[PDB]
């Protein structure tokens, strides 16, 4: 029942509810001569919202912000980006626009300054360092190390035991590491090992782009980026 790109039209978000309180956001884009889906993550924060990344883009992300008012009802007041690539920061501008803080990490906005960007406007401190775990209202913010990118977070939904893994961890129809430009595939086996020791309860596992799973998507990742490494 998960919306697959094949469904989604460029320009048009799906939600999916994962829990009470909590859902993904599905989007679509044209990338690198292909169209690629795209997930994020919603979490009621009482009687607002907190949004994990854009839809990828600003007339995408505008479509993700009317999607919400007329299935969920609740203003969006905070948005988190996990990296600073366009999937996760392009639409942070609508975003701001609409009245919606919007944060990230220092290295994430440096980065996403550097690539021209869209840049979220508040800092998250606290993640600095491969290990590092912040609460920020209802979900834990946890920096494995580097691994897609150098600034790549991942999220946790306590209530929900929900593992929303970002960019750094693959669907399983993922049979490369993806776009590597920015990554790191010497550590990365290293940062998911870290995401399965912090994390041995998670539920539900969601990549950046794809498919949701279990557990098995975090040592399927490790699979794939060691042999791509190799
Ligand atoms: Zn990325
Ligand atoms: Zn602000
Ligand atoms: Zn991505």
Do not use: M
Request: hydrophobic residues 40%; charged residues 20%.
């Amino acid at each position: 029942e998960y919306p697959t790109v094949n469904e989604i039209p460029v320009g048009e978000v799906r939600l999916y509810q994962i829990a009470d309180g909590v859902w993904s956001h599905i989007a679509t884009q044209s990338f690198d001569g292909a169209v690629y889906p795209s997930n994020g993550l919603i979490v009621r924060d009482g009687d607002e919202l907190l949004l994990i990344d854009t839809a990828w883009g600003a007339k995408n992300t505008a479509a993700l912000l009317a999607e919400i008012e007329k299935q969920i009802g609740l203003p969006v007041t905070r948005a988190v980006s996990t990296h600073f690539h366009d999937d996760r920061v392009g639409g942070v501008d609508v975003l701001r626009k609409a009245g919606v803080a919007t944060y990230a990490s220092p290295s994430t906005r440096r980065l996403a300054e550097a690539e021209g960007n869209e840049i979220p406007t508040h800092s998250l401190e606290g993640l600095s360092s491969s290990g590092d775990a912040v609460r920020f209202g209802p979900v834990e913010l946890f920096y494995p190390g580097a691994a897609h990118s150098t600034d790549n977070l991942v999220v946790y939904v306590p209530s929900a035991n929900v593992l929303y893994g970002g960019c750094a961890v693959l669907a399983l129809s993922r049979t490369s590491a993806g776009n590597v430009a920015d990554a790191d595939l010497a550590e990365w086996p290293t940062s998911v090992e870290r995401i399965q020791k912090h994390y041995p309860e998670a539920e539900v596992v969601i990549p950046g782009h794809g498919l949701p799973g279990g557990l098995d998507l975090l040592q399927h990742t490790a699979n794939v980026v060691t042999a791509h490494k190799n």
